[PDB]
Amino acid sequence: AQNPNCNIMIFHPTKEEFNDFDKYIAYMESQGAHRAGLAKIIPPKEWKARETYDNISEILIATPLQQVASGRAGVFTQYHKKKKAMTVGEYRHLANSKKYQTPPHQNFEDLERKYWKNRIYNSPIYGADISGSLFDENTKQWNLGHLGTIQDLLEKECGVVIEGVNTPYLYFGMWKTTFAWHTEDMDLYSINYLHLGEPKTWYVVPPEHGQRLERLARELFPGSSRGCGAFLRHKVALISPTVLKENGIPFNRITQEAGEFMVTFPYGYHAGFNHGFNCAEAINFATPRWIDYGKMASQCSCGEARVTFSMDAFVRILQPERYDLWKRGQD
């Protein structure tokens, strides 16, 4: 069995190997990369996402989200307060202001310590989930707006033809902006490219151990657990590495830098934070190996999770017994 300790693997494809996306995902899996829940892919030196970022300040962040925490430093939830629209140029200036800028620090480890000590005492503003792409149309390799669609994968594997679309999303971050513990919708894969700026630190639980994290989360957030049998789908709960280690939960960590891809694998729980002003692009995707995870994915039906249009078909075809309850939570 490859990668039996479920370590995060780092890949350096050559320019030839970078041509065929599906083939390279299958290669990484042949080496056991999925067992970690997360892999890093460093593009070949000949590749570029686009020519320059000199022209991005005019993008609009229609609904910036202020991430307000409640709890203790290692076990907290966050809620998103909507703020007035601002441009990327306005948001970058805000990120760099004295109130929001990254503090002086020695190295990534010192910064990580400061994040977990102090996160709860601040409310950073995140420009998340903005439909769009920063890949040049002429970039043919690993262009996240030119991937094979999840609908097409389901049609090819299962023969059924469904509505829905699959497009990328932009994320503008600042110091302390936070992504809560989650798996993807329908336990899909994700791929994330850090276009520019400061790093992103990730934490991940191996898919084979995801239910250990779920059981800890039910203990740590007991009112939330009574509210919903899949409350991690709400994407609001944080648990620190120190608390994970105290409770024996297997996990790994890695820091992504600008120019690097990360892939999350089906049912790989992940969480993390941004080091300073940055911009990432991410999208969900499927492979044949995903289908069994899609069939078994948990679902929130309490109303909180609310998701895209395109998840309807996935539930309807893969989980017909659950469909009626889940759709009530959508409506």
Ligand X SMILES: O=C(O)CNC(=O)C(=O)O
Annotated binding site for Fe cation: 182, 184, 270
User: Which option in ligand X, Mg ion, Zn ion, none does residue 58 bind, with CB closer than 5 to 8 A by kind?
Assistant: Mg ion
What are the two backbone dihedrals, phi and then psi, of residue 182, each rounded to the nearest 5 degrees? -160, 160
Considering the complex, what minimum distance in angstroms separates the CB of residue 91 from Mg ion?
12
Q: Which stretch binds Zn ion (CB under 5 A): 37-45, 93-101, 194-202, 227-235?
A: 227-235
Q: Which is nearer to Mg ion, 271 or 280 (CB)?
A: 280
- Rounded CA gap, 183 and 119, in Å? 22
Q: Which is nearer to ligand X, 123 or 323 (CB)?
A: 123
Q: Is 300 in the site for Zn ion (CB under 5 A)?
A: yes
Specify burial of residue 94 (Cβ count, 10 A radius: 0-12, 13-18, 19+): middle
Considering the complex, what minimum distance in angstroms separates the CB of residue 87 from Mg ion?
8
Considering the complex, what minimum distance in angstroms separates the CB of residue 33 from ligand X?
15
Instruction: Count interface residues toward Ni ion (CB under 5 A).
Output: 1
DSSP 103: P
Which residue in 147, 213, 254, 282 binds ligand X (CB under 6 A)? 282
Residue 5 structure tokens: 């300790």
Terminal-residue alpha carbon distance, the chain:
44
Which residues lie closer than 8 Å to 90 by C-beta, 6 or more apart?
Answer: none
Q: Which is nearer to ligand X, 179 or 290 (CB)?
A: 179
Q: Is 58 in the site for Mg ion (CB under 5 A)?
A: yes
The closest residue (CB) to ligand X is 190
User: Which option in ligand X, Ni ion, Zn ion, none does residue 280 bind, with CB closer than 5 to 8 A by kind?
Assistant: ligand X
- Which residues are known binding-site members for 2-oxoglutarate? 126, 192, 200, 235
Considering the complex, what minimum distance in angstroms separates the CB of residue 78 from Zn ion?
16
CB under 8 Å, gap of 24 or more: what pairs does 88-94 form? 88/56, 88/57, 88/58, 88/59, 88/60, 88/61, 88/127, 88/172, 88/279, 89/57, 89/58, 91/61, 91/64, 91/125, 91/127, 91/172, 91/174, 91/277, 92/57, 92/172, 92/277, 94/125, 94/174
Q: Which is nearer to Ni ion, 96 or 201 (CB)?
A: 201
Could you tell me if 202 and 181 are in contact, meaning their C-beta atoms sit under 8 angstroms apart? no
- Rounded CA gap, 40 and 80, in Å? 29
> If you search the block for the tokens 């800028």, which residue do you land on?
101
Residues 173-192 touching Ni ion, rule: CB under 5 A, are 190
Site string for Mg ion, 214-253 (x = CB under 5 A): ----------------------------------------
Instruction: Count interface residues toward ligand X (CB under 6 A).
Output: 8
Q: Identify the three-state secondary structure at position 314.
A: helix
Q: Is 192 in the site for ligand X (CB under 6 A)?
A: yes
Residue 111 structure tokens: 């910064």
User: Which option in Zn ion, ligand X, Mg ion, none does residue 258 bind, with CB closer than 5 to 8 A by kind?
Assistant: none
Instruction: Please report, to the nearest 10 degrees, the dihedral formed by the alpha carbons of residues 290, 253, 198, 265 taken in order.
Output: 0
> If you search the block for the tokens 């050559």, which residue do you land on?
14
Instruction: Count interface residues toward Mg ion (CB under 5 A).
Output: 2
Which residue in 76, 115, 171, 181 binds ligand X (CB under 6 A)? 171
Contacting residues toward ligand X, per CB under 6 A: 171, 179, 190, 192, 264, 270, 280, 282
Contacting residues toward Ni ion, per CB under 5 A: 190
